[PDB]
Amino acid sequence: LWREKINLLNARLAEAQTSEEQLQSQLDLQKKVVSDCMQRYLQVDSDASVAKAKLDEAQTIESELDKQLRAANKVTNVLDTELTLARAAERKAQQTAQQGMKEEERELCASHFPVVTLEQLPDIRDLERQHERGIQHEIERVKAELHRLNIELT
Amino acid sequence: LDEAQTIESELDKQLRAANKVTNVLDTELTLARAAERKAQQTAQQGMKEE
């Protein structure tokens, strides 16, 4: 389930990175237009006045793109934290799951155990404890019955 | 002009990096305020001091 979560989070983080990179590239190209104005000034509504006007336009437009890039970073950091948490959970579960089992053991475990889903993944720790307690409460009763049968046999 | 533009780019990158802390703190404060409002509402259900 955490690997499925990581699969979804990788796509979401890729989208967030794409948005942030696109916004940053547009902002940097708006900045680079300033240097392109200097380049044209060197290569030659006169040209110097055009360079001044375009520099002013770029500086005016820079602010909204900066704010949008801030929002993109806001999204990207949230998704990065999500991916980090999912990876940490998957790494915790990995070494315990890697122990391996036989076919018969896997069939036995499938019976009487639950099937968790990605949506309910956060509550898995509670389900594990619930099943542990369920086994324990039955085992103690069966132990009492076994003691009773031992007494009856004697 | 060249030096000022270079320093302007440096400061802009610094501000871009700094925005992360403000974003994280804003998210945490919003969640904390929501949780505190929930706890206060559950706390105000009516109780004697004893």
Rounded to an integer in angstroms, the radius of gyration calculated over CA atoms of chain A is 31 Å
Determine the most extensive contact between two protein chains: A-B, 10 and 9 residues
Shape of chain A: rod-shaped
Order of helices and strands of chain A: HHHH
Q: Please identify the structural class of chain A as seen in this structure.
A: mainly alpha
What is the CA-CA span between the terminal residues of chain A? 51 Å
Oligomer: part of a larger assembly
Count of strand segments of chain A? 0
Total helical elements of chain A: 4
Query: What does the main sheet of chain A amount to?
Result: none
> Helical residue percent of chain A?
over 70%
Strand content of chain A: under 5%
PDB class: dna binding protein
Keywords: SMC complexes, Wadjet, JetABCD, DNA loop extrusion, DNA binding protein
Entry title: E. coli JetABC monomer in a DNA boarding conformation
Chains A, B: JetC
